[model samples]
Target chain A: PRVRAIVTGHTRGLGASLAEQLLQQDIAVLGVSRSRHPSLAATAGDRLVETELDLSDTAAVAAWLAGGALRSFVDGASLVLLFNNAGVVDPIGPLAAQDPALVARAVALNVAAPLMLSAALVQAAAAPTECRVLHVSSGAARNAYAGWSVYCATKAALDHHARAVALDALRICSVAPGVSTPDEAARHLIRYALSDAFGAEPTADVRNL
Target chain B: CAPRVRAIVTGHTRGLGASLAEQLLQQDIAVLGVSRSRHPSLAATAGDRLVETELDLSDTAAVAAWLAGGALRSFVDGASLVLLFNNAGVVDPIGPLAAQDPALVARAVALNVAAPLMLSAALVQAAAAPTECRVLHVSSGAARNAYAGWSVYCATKAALDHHARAVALDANRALRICSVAPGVVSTPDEAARHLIRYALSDAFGAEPTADVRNLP
Candidate 1:
């Protein structure tokens, strides 16, 4: 079975590192981001397809989804992995002080985008193909940051979605969970991920362990 | 006796919403009901103890405008004990996530999660509580447990649970926060009395959440 990976917000940091790591492993990558990573095309050539899409814009994401790009990407791939890695830590203040517009935008990116993609990926993948979704969620999703009412709620939203979807879709495993810095976290996740019975369920901050 | 108490109950037109408003008004506490439409029955019975705000909570723009318009401030002004009940939530856009409409998903989140968070914040700012301000986000059992074909409802309710965890930590403006899962309403009167018992009880906000079968 052909394997393909779709990684969002790959312009920098964890997503960028993850995209690079996936390409090094010879997995075809569909890199999604709102920023430019000019070096990506040079590195993987056609093996890496880049999408400049704002995840916070739900309407635009729907439009992009309707464009059949995702369906085309995973067409015959026997295994597809979707990294719902794009999210924001902003609106980082007390709930009362948070901006309304920014609240919607943060939830849109942190919750809406991931849910939309998870549902979309399931339908788009070939019947015989397997699908896995990893929501690069945060510790704030489980443990509330005093000033992060907006951020925590949105991230927490995704975690529960992971719980519900796991039950809804048979044989599909999705995890929305939390972690540390981008580079170190990515390395840690990739290391255990190949062998660890991790993230198949809703998870908490096991970094303490 | 305890100074005037005020409450803002969303979705106050029916069922549990109506009961909460009715009970709160019975105690002569002022109430501002935010809902899609208004009711004349409350007008006949409530007198000035009830003030209805015609707001589609899912319409973030409308809620934002209403918040900025000084109505919340007026309702909340000079209240010693203030309570904001984030009771409005939508369980629509169910089924597989792929079958869900984007706009419908937005609507659900806005009503269930964003709307409550925003209202909690706005009330915090509006009520300069002489004693303390209490924010109760009416959550559900679905918040913790997963049900197939019901992710949106679960996730958004879960959002309220986490929101309470954070706001309880923040403790801003002498605020105490709790997101209670009302397991089964049983009957509207039973639910309202149970809710009022907790809302006015010392045990309110004792924990960030009330995860009991019926009421806390």
Candidate 2:
């Protein structure tokens, strides 16, 4: 049984690095995003399965996850790790000055998408294997930021979700991942993932970086 | 001389909002009640001091128009203290976040976050100088603690709390803002049943209550 990981926002930033790092460790990676990372796809070969789709489209994502692709992917693995990393920082201004539509869009991408995807994963994964979820949170989650109200609120939602799910006997982690380059953070995250320290507790252990 | 006290409370048709409106009237404060529909019994009983406006908070444009059209300013005219209580919120579309309708999620955000924020801004601008304007957002413990199936509600409530913190930083001499998390209170039977249903189903963490009467 091979190790399989699902990473959202895998075309760029921290998500991209996490996907690449997991592939380097001989793990199968299912990369989901709006656009495909061509270079990474070429290098990682069959180990990297890129699904160029919008996470904000809940219906489509739900269908895809419930369909044959995700089931087959999960079937092939002994361990399943889900990284909910896709998020939006739009409507970035004073709360009064921001547009309602943009705020809704931010909620869709940052809050709704992650929750939906996590639900899909939980339902798709059956008995007899290990399953874990990690939510990429930020310092803004615990602290209030003036111009980034939507971002802060959404990330905080993730923290609470992780906390509540842990009570239901699931292993989860929510971390800020610190102020390093995506590559550096990816290295640390990969080490943490493979290390015995990762899922030692049922509840999410939140920390800076 | 003390200026007259006036208040504008949303969702005054029922529940906590209605209670707050009635209490303000008893205190001799002029009250402007906003909701999607009129509460005839309360309106008939409260008389001239209570003015009820049937305005849906989800209609953001109408809310802004009503404010900018001078109605809100006129309501607060000559008041020394004007309190805006943002109390209207919905917990519908409750279940796993994945099973929720996207439209309903947006509606929750509109009512819980955008409406209150817009109303607060309008009140700050409309209230006269020397009038102490206060915005009280009726938050819940859900804002700080997340429930599994309450992703939308939790997020929207947190947005309100964070908005108050941000406003506090840029407070004007006459304006003050606070987000208060009121502990569990008895709600209508329907709402209570919904809460209990979710809790029992483990959609929210398991906690049991026999009835709404048991709530404080």
Candidate 3:
């Protein structure tokens, strides 16, 4: 059986690259985003399964996963990896200047959605199978940015989640891929994913690209 | 109108919020209380200075409306100092993350994270330039330390701490923000229960010493 991976926010930027690179490795990719990436879809053909999803809508994401949409990708997989790469840097500005609704939406997308999906994936994947959760964390998670309060906080939440959940999992990792271009970060991450030492243990710390 | 200080404290019916509100009133600052229930005893002595608005902070729309709908903004008019105390929070579904209910976790984020962010935004926009704006988020030690079952609580509190740190970086002269852990406030019943629980919890590594149980 081929290795399977789920990449959130897969329509653009780093997520798109992760999906494309995973597909190139003959790894089945389930690309999730609000809009479809036509170019990647066309190129990857049947190997890339794209799902148009708004991760900010937690209920919809939960229903989609719980309704057996994820089972096809999860079942019978020797190695299952979930790349929680979807996030938003919105409500950016002075904490008081941000729109409340937008802040809520950011939390829903950046924190709630990934956590829900991780939980569901854990339940769906059978024991004895190597299950890995890779959270694409950021420097903002560890260092505070002046205007990006919500963004900084949400990213930090991902780091903490990876740490706490690692206590139970065989292996989980959170890596902060520097200020490199999205493609470069994706390349580094893909290299890490394909490494022999990947997912060997619970590693929760920041790593430069 | 005279220049008076006004404060808005959420979860004013109990815990640190109630104490904060009462102290503000004693210092001659007017207070607008937001909570699910009204505390009549606090309001009785507070008289006209206390305007209690019963609201569940989980209702984001209602919170937004209360701030932008002119009701909250109007209270700040002619005030030289505007204070927003983002003190409402819930610590429920305290178990392993996988065992926790998704709905309860969402609720915790809504109250602990969203409510504070929204209210702070509203205050910054509405307060005048000369008025000193202060936002105090009642954060916790959990913000920096990760306990086994307190993932939601830890994450939400950390968000608030980072929000304060980020906001302070802007160097806005009129605004000051702080996330402070008051170090285990002794609120009788609630405090005792939580202390005993944490002491007994295997997650904290060891049971509380005699000094911890004597905390008041």
Candidate 4:
């Protein structure tokens, strides 16, 4: 069967990195984000299809996926692998310093958008192949980091929603892809190269490339 | 026999539903046999008290409307509505997640999780004025165990268990909401099909060692 990978918020940051990684694996990658980033072209290469759209607008994302537009891009791809990686840290402050607008945006983007996207993907891939959903969560979901109440709550809600869908659907996993610290960001690409050079299949030590 | 309570058994046509209906009926309680198909054994003994409602529990709107319209409200009018047993559910096709059909998976969720919630909502609303009400959701060991092929089934039951806990916590006064994990009885029937499937599936961790199929 065909394999198509969709990464949300792939314009920059971790989203871009994940898209690049998936593309390296020879998977057709579909990237969606509001703004275009410099890395999009270099990493995506020929296999990457970029779509400019704001996922906060629920109807737009829903329509975009349901409108046969995504399906046309998939061609005859049966397997749809979704990496729900988009997130926002809007109205960043303490619990007492909460802003309604920021909270709404956070919940809408982090939690609601992922759910809507999953639904759309499920519908789109209903016929072709089995769909797999993977949520990119954070340590903030489990740890109560101060000044990150809204972020934590949003991520926690996203994780719960992910669990709900996982319970309700087949072929789903919710994973906490830890955040990239400043030190880690400065490091080079992390790679795993497998070699059967000596005798048996040997694994190289995981290190920054 | 003097009756003490009344119960409604959806999917009472067979298996656990049938057994529950039979037990309650034998206890001198009135049972409304709700199922798409009717069982002759259940119907024969139910007599006038056993009002067989030929309706699908998955039809949330119809079930809700019917409850709110008259039957439920009137049933608990003079009598105390003690227990509501949400027993109807379906196991996802016994296989790996990728091997199972999406429609069937969706159907399993709808039948097991959503419909029970909808039914519970209706029953909760109907039993508002009752002296005492106990909402019981019949859960399975599958809810706790992550068997290889029963992912969908496990999730649905887990959801129901959580829903039962939520209802128990959220009710205004104090409604006894039980997500009861009933014992696996010795039976060779459709109700036990999923359990039996689990026992034989080799992937099941908690299957009892005493060959359940041969038990009397």
Candidate with top TM-score is 3
Fraction of true contacts reproduced, model 3? 0.25
lDDT of each: 0.70, 0.65, 0.69, 0.55
The candidate with the higher lDDT, 1 or 4, is 1
**lDDT tens digits, residues A25-140, model 1?**
67788988887675888868778999889988777887887778999999998767777778887777775677767777777788778777777788787678767666655667
Candidate 4 is graded, for docking, as incorrect
Candidate 3 versus the native: TM-score?
0.79
Task: Please give, for residues A32-61, the per-residue lDDT of candidate 4 as tens digits.
Answer: 888765665775567888888887655456
Prediction 2 global C-alpha lDDT: 0.65
Q: lDDT tens digits, residues B97-138, model 1?
A: 667776677778878887887787778777764745677677
The C-alpha stretches of model 4 lying farther than 4 A from their native spots are: A1-80, A83-132, A135-172, A175-209, B1-4, B64-68, B185-216
* TM-score of each predicted structure versus truth: 0.78, 0.64, 0.79, 0.53
* TM-score ranking, best first: 3, 1, 2, 4
Where is the poorest 10-residue window by lDDT in model 3 chain A? A200-209
The DockQ-derived docking category for candidate 1 is incorrect
Model 1 scores a TM of 0.78
lDDT of 4 by residue, B123-163 (tens): 55555554455556666666545555565566556555544
lDDT of 2 by residue, B22-126 (tens): 767766777899999987577677787788888878655566566668788778888887878788899755766335655565456567766776677678767
Please give, for residues B71-105, the per-residue lDDT of candidate 3 as tens digits.
77777877888778787899775766456666666
Candidate 2 chain B least-lDDT 10 residues: B203-212
TM-score of chain A of each: 0.80, 0.81, 0.82, 0.76
Error of 1 at B208 (Å): 24
